[PDB]
């Protein structure tokens, strides 16, 4: 498993953030840099066990059979969420970055650009 599917560019996230979090982005960038590099290394999982070999060749062949029906049944989970509240914070921070600031910016850039049509006089 590689980087989580969503990829935003490393300079477009990494220059710009709300004023409330301004210094925390440049740290969180480096924290996500070490995590994305640290996770990109790993073969996700080992091989299986050759069982008929292990049962023949460990001459304690009945200790072996416990560990078959145990290991063949005993399956590992992937770790869970605890911080996808960053996606709700991202929808709220897009309502802020887009809609709230976008429409407010479109009336303020127009406040100047309508004064630039007045400056044509």
């Amino acid at each position: 498993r590689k980087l989580a599917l969503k990829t935003i560019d490393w300079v477009a996230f990494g220059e710009i953030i709300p004023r409330n979090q301004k210094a925390v982005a440049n740290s969180l960038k480096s924290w996500n840099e070490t995590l994305t590099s640290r996770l990109a290394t790993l073969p996700e999982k080992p091989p299986a066990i050759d069982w008929a070999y292990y049962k023949a060749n460990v001459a304690k062949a009945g200790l072996v059979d416990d560990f078959e029906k145990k290991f063949n049944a005993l399956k590992v989970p992937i770790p869970e969420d605890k911080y996808t509240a960053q996606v709700d914070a991202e929808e709220k921070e897009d309502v802020k970055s887009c809609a709230e600031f976008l429409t407010q910016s479109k009336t303020r850039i127009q406040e100047y650009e309508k004064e630039l049509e007045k400056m044509r006089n």
């Binding site: 292990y54 200790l63 560990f67």
Partner: protein, 58 residues
């Protein structure tokens, strides 16, 4: 984490078999040997192969 658990057993059965082998072997050899010469025929099998040297290396 599983593997270590099987491998003791193997590795012990390997070491054990050698330690039975050497101890069997040593005790075994150290008991029986002597009666061999009272077969003079262990020097007759020397003479036998030796007469099949003595004809049959010439």
């Amino acid at each position: 984490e599983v593997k270590n658990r099987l491998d003791y057993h193997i590795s012990v059965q390997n070491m054990m078999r050698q330690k039975e082998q050497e101890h069997m072997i040593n005790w075994v050899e150290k008991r029986v040997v002597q009666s061999i010469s009272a077969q003079q025929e262990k020097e007759t099998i020397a003479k036998c192969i030796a007469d099949l040297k003595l004809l049959s290396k010439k």
